[PDB]
Structure formats: C-alpha cells, structure tokens
Amino acid sequence: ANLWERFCNWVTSTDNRLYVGWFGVIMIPTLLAATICFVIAFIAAPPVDIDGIREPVSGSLLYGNNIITGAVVPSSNAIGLHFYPIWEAASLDEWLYNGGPYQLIIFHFLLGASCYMGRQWELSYRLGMRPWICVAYSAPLASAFAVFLIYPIGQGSFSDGMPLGISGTFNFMIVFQAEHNILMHPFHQLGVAGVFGGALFCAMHGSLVTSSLIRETTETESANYGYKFGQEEETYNIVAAHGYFGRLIFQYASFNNSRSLHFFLAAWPVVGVWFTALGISTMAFNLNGFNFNHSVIDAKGNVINTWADIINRANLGMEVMHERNAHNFPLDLA
Amino acid sequence: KLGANVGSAQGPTGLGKYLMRSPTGEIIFGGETMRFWDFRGPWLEPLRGPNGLDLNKIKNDIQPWQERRAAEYMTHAPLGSLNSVGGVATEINSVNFVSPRSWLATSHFVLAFFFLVGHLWHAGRARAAAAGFEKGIDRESEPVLSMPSLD
Amino acid sequence: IFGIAFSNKRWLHFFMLFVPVTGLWMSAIGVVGLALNLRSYDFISQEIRAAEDPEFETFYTKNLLLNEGIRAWMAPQDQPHENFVFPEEVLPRGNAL
Amino acid sequence: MEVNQLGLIATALFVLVPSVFLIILYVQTESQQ
C-alpha cells in the first residue's frame, strides 16, 4: 500500500511488543523528554530560587543531596504561572537558576501521562476488551494533575507545585496541613479510607484466593506450578473461599459472585482516590478542612480545648516557620 | 503614613519590602504577592503608569477610597473552612465567611472532573458497543488467540 | 501497555497478600524504634555542611525548621504535665508570621 | 559531604551478596535438564 497507510497500520499494530497507537505518538516523545530532563536535573542541576527571594535551594546529587533529600525544585515564585520554556531565558544559566527544568518536566509528564490513559482505552479497543481500565487509571492521574497543576493555578504559582523529590514531597505535605488543615477535610479522609481500604481488600482477596487453591502440586514444589497460563478452569474454589469468609463475618457480608467482588475491588480505591484528588483540587481554591478551633466554650466563656485545638497548635508551628524569609505582611493569603 | 520611604525600603531578602521589579522590569508589589503582579483592578490602576506601579502617584495620590477598598479586600480574601470559618486554617472561630469565588470554583472543578470521567466511561462504552464487545469477549472468537505471540 | 504482566494467577494473588502485609510489618518495626526515640531524624553530613555553610539549603533542612516550629508551638498545650511556659520572645518564627 | 566511610562498603555488600546468591541459583536452574 501507500506510505501513510502502512505507517498507520504499524502505529496501530496489535503485534508490536509495546503498543504504540495514536496516543502513543504524543506519549513517547513527551515522556522521554520529561524522563531525560528529570534524570539530568536530579543528578546535576544547580540550586533553584523556588520562593523568588534569591535564596536558592539545592536539589541535585552533585550539589550535596542524597536520594532522600534530592529533588527537582519547583520554578521561582517571581515567575508565578508564567510560561517559562528554555527559549524565554537569556541563557541556560538563568533558566537553571529560576527552576526551568521543573516546568519542562511536569508539562511533558502530565501530557504524556494523559496520553498513557488514552493509550489504555486504545489498546483495549484493538484487543476487543471492555474499555474501563483507563477509568481506574484516571484516579492516580487526577492526583498528579492536582499537585503539579491545579494547586499551582489556585495559589497563583508553580513554586507551590509539589517538588519532584522525596523530602520535597514531605515539605509540600506539611505546608499543605498548615494552610488547609487537610487532615480535617472529608475528601482527604475519603482518600485514607480508599488507600487503607484498598490495602485491606488487597490483602483480603490475595489471602482468600490463596486459601482456596486447588491441590495440583506435591510438597516439594511451589503451588504456583499448579496454574498454567491460559488454562480454561479456575485455579481456586470460590465456593470454599465464600464458605470461609461468610462464616468469618456473616454469609451476606461475603461475595460469591467474582464479577461483583472484582468490581468492588476496582471501585473502592478508585473512588476514594478520586475524592482525595478533589480534596487537593478544591483546597487549591482555599475551601479547607473543618475548623473547630475554640468551638467548645464553658459557662463563663473560657475556651475548653479539644483535640482540634491541639492540631491547631501544631499547624501554627508549621505556619510560622515555613518559608521563613518570604513573608513581609501578617497574613499568608496564598 | 508613618514615614517610610517605600521605594527605598529593602526587605530582609534584599528585594524591596513594598516594591520590586517583575522579571520584565515593571514596578510591582513585593513579598509573596510578587506572583500576583498580572492582577488588574479598578482600585489599583490609578497608581499604575507605563512602567508599572508609579512611585510619585503612590507617594501623593492614594485616595481614602483606595485605602478602604484595599482593607476590605485584604480582609475578605477567598480563604476559609468547609464549615465557613473565614480566614486561614489556624484562625479562631468568629467570622462566618467563605467567598462565593471559592464555592463556585470548587463546585465546578468537582463537576468538570466527574464529567471528564463520564466522557471516558461513555466514549469507551460507545466504541465497544458499536463494535460488538461491550458485554465481554466471545470465548470461541477471543481475538488475542488469533494474534501472533509477542515473543 | 506497561512492558510486563502477570501470567500466573496463583503468583498474582499471593503477591496481593505479600505487598500490603509486608508494608505494615515494616512500619511496625519503625515504630518499635521510635518507642526508644531511635529515629531517622537527621543526616549527619547535611548537618555538618549546613552548619559551616550558611548558603547551603535543601528540602531536608527546610523540613527540620517546620519540626522545630511544631515542637515549640504544640508542646505547652500537648504536654501539660511539663508546665512549659515559653515566653513569646523564644518562640521560633520566620518573618511577619 | 562528610559521609560515613563505611557507607560505601555497606551499600556494596548489601547489593552484591544477595544479588550473587540469586544469580547462582538462577544459572544452575537453567543448566538443569
């Protein structure tokens, strides 16, 4: 055939070891660029003026970090939400000082991860599968958008984006608690129920299916040799599993339908994580966790502290110390 | 009003405490609000000249109505709790306020997001149903079984 | 999509037990250490550099400033048996706030 | 950076000792009939 048709058949071929696809044509270059820039920055970038106060923070290994302290540092507060590609800088030296690598990385990554999600729909169509694995992936993806893009938009600066590093992530978390009382926000609470519950049901399901594996192997072999890839027959007895768990709790608290069970395993973490993504994306516009500071008052009007007041004291310590040379006026309004 | 020369007042970092330059030179407010220098509003524009905030105008022309507006807006910043306690998260109970801007932005981000999800759900479903595999894989015509191995 | 996949269903389900069970067990070991204040509190090399070099800053040194704030500001009300009185002048604070 | 002098040997043995254990076991599995 003609060259375009051949190219299209190759792009969309079900036979490539890794699927390419049309989402793939955007994903591949954008993830490669974000990856390469990230690796080089993390090793060798000089210090970055994150808070725009000429106080540059060292993120890279060669400039005194280790794996736990290192990071690619967010772009300068002087930039705010302005687009700062390489060609906006007078030189690579300036670009590095002002945190240009962060913006190149996060924009190429969010674009590429968005195409990763589309590529999941795309391959499922080519294989004749149902289409919703990409919906499950929208949960972690949404979370990535929240901390790298939506929170910056709300607060007016990429300098408030999550840093690309271990200790930077903890820094973002502690300041967020100071400024939003995230722990007292029900969507974060839904998030914790989602991940603690996803872990719990993960261990539960693994353990119940493992409990009920059909004997197919001798004592001197891993039971895993009892299952052969592609075999038609189920490898465990779900009725034995349900018999066990139904007695553990009570019968109607247990699933005997594998489809219903598996849908629940999908839904519970995906939904909780959609809520926690939305916690970050709505605290981005400063609708914050519950504030019960001084809610309990005695007959005279003395304040009777609750555990909410003690949280408040901790939050205050975070507040007054964070970005210790960056505030000149008495309220931290963003 | 207390006597400060706001143009020449160097803050702790070396940047101007009240006034500084944007990355393209324009005169802008200092402190963390450097990020917000693209802001434009009718209470502030009279102070702005071709080079940004105009120091002569700042020193001589700020009207009481501009002071009032600025104090009002500073004290109704769009920050508050889910139970409508106005202010920063460490604020005490007293002021029942959450900005309409926050309620409207948050609600609509939530709705836009779940609508994106609905778009993917229904678009993926429509594609599958048009092609005939929305209820699952035909056990006797499983397409992957007719494909060559990846390796 | 991802480059690798499960091919053995028994391994899959075992791994689902292994991952979150092992993680919780690791977290318990850390808290046994904390019983004794045997913390991963610091990186000594970071502290030596930062003490000698007042232009050296990392996210690690930043977080320690937050911790110092939490301890000073919370301890008096959180630990009432200590009868702490911390005059306003000794409290750690950055500029303005 | 004034790092601990045993950090290098500790990291190196931590990787190499169990890794070589696995390699030993893998190769002699492949060489079986």
Binding site: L61, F229, G230 | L145 | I4 | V15
Partner: peptide
C-alpha cells in the same frame, strides 16, 4: 563516591527494566 553509588544503583535498575521486559520468560499458552 556517594553520587556515583546512587547513580550506579539507579542505572542498574534501568538495565533490569530492559531485561525484564525484552528478555522475559515468554508467556506460553500451551
């Protein structure tokens, strides 16, 4: 020494990814 060590471990992990993907044990349906 420390930087070389952290980069070396990382590089080994990236190499492991390449072998685990392209030199995997092929899934066999039979």
């Amino acid at each position: 020494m420390e930087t070389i060590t952290y980069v070396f471990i990382f590089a080994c992990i990236i190499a492991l990814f390449f072998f685990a993907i392209f030199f995997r044990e092929p899934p066999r349906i039979t």
